[PDB]
C-alpha cells in the first residue's frame, strides 16, 4: 500500500450526504501525464498536496 502525492489542479465541487467531501482533480508529480479525481474529506485547498493510500481507487464523478 504505497503512499504518493499529487497536486490539486481544479477543485471540482462539494458532495456528500449532508456535505463533507470535496471532489477535486489531482495531477501526479512523478508522471504529470495522468490525473485522477478524488473526494477528499475535510477542508481542502487549491494547489496543495494530498496523501492518498490507494492510487487505483477513484470516487464517483459528476
Amino acid at each position: 500500500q504505497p503512499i504518493k502525492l499529487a497536486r490539486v489542479t481544479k477543485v471540482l465541487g462539494r458532495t456528500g450526504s449532508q456535505g463533507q467531501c470535496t471532489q477535486v482533480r489531482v495531477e501526479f508529480m512523478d508522471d504529470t501525464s495522468r490525473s485522477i479525481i478524488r473526494n477528499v474529506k475535510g477542508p481542502v485547498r487549491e494547489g496543495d498536496v494530498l496523501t492518498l493510500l490507494e492510487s487505483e481507487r477513484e470516487a464517483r464523478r459528476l
Binding site: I3, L5, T15, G16, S17, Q20, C21, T22, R38, N39, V40, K41, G42, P43, V44, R45, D48, V49, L50, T51, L52, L53, E54, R57, A59, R60
Partner: protein, 189 residues
C-alpha cells in the same frame, strides 16, 4: 531573541513532509515566543492555517466546560512538559512535536455517498487541516483521560503522550484509536 520560550531552537526544524509542510510549519518571523494572542484565528476559513502549530495545540487544551477559556493554564501546561519532553527524549521540543502529530493523524476516513445511500460508505482522502485538528483533539483527550481518575496530573500526560506518539507506540490513546478507525475504514473500503 527568536526562539520559542527562549530555549527551543528555531533553526533545526526539518521539512519532513516535502510538500505537506505548508500546513505544519514553524520557521517564519511570525513564530512568536508565548503562544497567547487571543482568539482571532477562528474568524475566517484558514486564517487558523497560518497560525503556528504550538499556538493551536495549546488552545485545544481547554475542554469540558469547567476549564473553558483558561489559556493561561494551557500555556503553563505546555511550557511544562515541553521543558520535560526533549529533556527525557533529547531532540527539540518542536521537531518531536511535529513528528508526534504527524504520527497521530489519520489519513483515510469513511463517508456515506449518494442521495439515499444508507447501507455502505466509501473511503476518502483526509486533508491536512482535518487530520491535524482531529489529532490534536485526540492527544488532548488522551491527556485528559490519563489525568482523569488516574495517578498522573496535567502538564505531564501531554509529555508522555507526545513521546509515545513520536515513538509510534500503542500506549498513546491517539494512535491506538487512529488504528481502530483505520481498521474500521479498511473493513469499509
Amino acid at each position: 531573541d527568536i526562539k520559542l520560550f527562549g530555549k527551543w531552537s528555531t533553526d533545526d526544524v526539518q521539512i519532513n513532509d516535502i510538500s505537506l509542510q505548508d500546513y505544519i510549519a514553524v520557521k517564519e518571523k511570525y513564530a512568536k515566543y508565548l503562544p497567547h494572542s487571543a482568539g482571532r484565528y477562528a474568524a475566517k476559513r484558514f486564517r487558523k492555517a497560518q497560525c503556528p502549530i504550538v499556538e493551536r495545540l495549546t488552545n485545544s487544551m481547554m475542554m469540558h466546560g469547567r476549564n473553558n477559556g483558561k489559556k493561561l493554564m494551557t500555556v503553563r501546561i505546555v511550557k511544562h512538559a515541553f521543558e520535560i519532553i526533549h529533556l527525557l527524549t533529547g531532540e527539540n521540543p518542536l521537531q518531536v512535536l511535529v513528528n508526534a502529530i504527524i504520527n497521530s493523524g489519520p489519513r483515510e476516513d469513511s463517508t456515506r455517498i449518494g442521495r439515499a445511500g444508507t447501507v455502505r460508505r466509501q473511503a476518502v482522502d483526509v486533508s491536512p487541516l482535518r487530520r491535524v485538528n482531529q489529532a490534536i483533539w485526540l492527544l488532548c483527550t488522551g491527556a485528559r483521560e490519563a489525568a482523569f481518575r488516574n495517578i498522573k496530573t496535567i502538564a505531564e500526560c501531554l509529555a508522555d503522550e507526545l513521546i509515545n506518539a513520536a515513538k509510534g507506540s500503542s500506549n498513546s490513546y491517539a494512535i491506538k484509536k487512529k488504528d481502530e478507525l483505520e481498521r474500521v475504514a479498511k473493513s469499509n473500503r
